[PDB]
Design a protein around this ligand. Structure first.
Ligand SMILES: [Cl-]
Ligand SMILES: [Cl-]
Ligand SMILES: [Zn+2]
Ligand SMILES: [Zn+2]
Ligand SMILES: [Zn+2]
Ligand SMILES: [Zn+2]
Lengths: 140, 140
């Protein structure tokens, strides 16, 4: 095993001030460093970087389901939904879910990066799939 | 603190077979589940999902520096470079670095998702910046 975990995630942003506010208020990340065109945050031990790229096209990202999910409790999820609405966040309509999928909220940052708050675990999902799914291969 | 860490990351992919091979051989992730249009992996405790979206445009992603970095040792980095070359991986020219930036390799998956192998830590970067940088604010 030559990799030793996530080191950092970096998001390209169009407006540093607007993005800092999102990362602080919505993702609850702690701002560590702010430069002209850069910011670093700690979110529960994860190093997040924002890098400003002002004039690049940001349309196609809307079509891709690439996304990052963070763990929240069921109680936290109901509160967070109102926080997202109060902050005029772009909330995405989620996919159809089985009860066994557990609950999620999907949304974006100002530049289209998709995020999720999720109340389940991988083990919930594997146990669900193993019980229910056909046309699938399980390797564990 | 209402978030409890990364839950999962999901990548939209154009070709499931080709992407599975990349995630196994390049990122060293363990395949857990394969469906028609979905795969799940464990990479050192991180749940990675691949979701197939065949016909979406994937050009603009090339212009954005959004990326995910994984921790490797200096020795691992030299080996991994040859693994990337041997597998015809799209290796990106990195930015200029100070020695204190520590070493990195940057590359993409088949669909343009940018990744990095990095040999430093956040604390290395903060200590460097605090010693050297002007036009910056430090909050820790
Ligand atoms: Cl079926
Ligand atoms: Cl200067
Ligand atoms: Zn998800
Ligand atoms: Zn069937
Ligand atoms: Zn990086
Ligand atoms: Zn100066």
């Amino acid at each position: 095993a030559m990799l030793q975990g996530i080191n950092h995630i970096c998001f390209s942003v169009s407006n540093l001030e607007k993005s800092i506010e999102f990362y602080q208020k919505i993702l609850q990340a702690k701002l560590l460093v702010k430069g002209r065109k850069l910011a670093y945050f700690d979110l529960n031990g994860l190093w997040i970087a924002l890098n400003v790229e002002e004039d690049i096209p940001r349309n196609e990202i809307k079509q891709s389901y690439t996304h990052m999910a963070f763990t929240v409790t069921n109680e936290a999820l109901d509160h967070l939904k109102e926080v997202l609405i109060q902050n005029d966040v772009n909330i995405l309509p989620g996919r159809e879910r089985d009860e066994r999928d557990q609950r999620s909220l999907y949304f974006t940052d100002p530049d289209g990066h998709k995020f999720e708050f999720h109340t389940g675990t991988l083990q919930n999902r594997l146990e669900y799939y193993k019980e229910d799914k056909k046309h699938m291969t399980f390797y564990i």
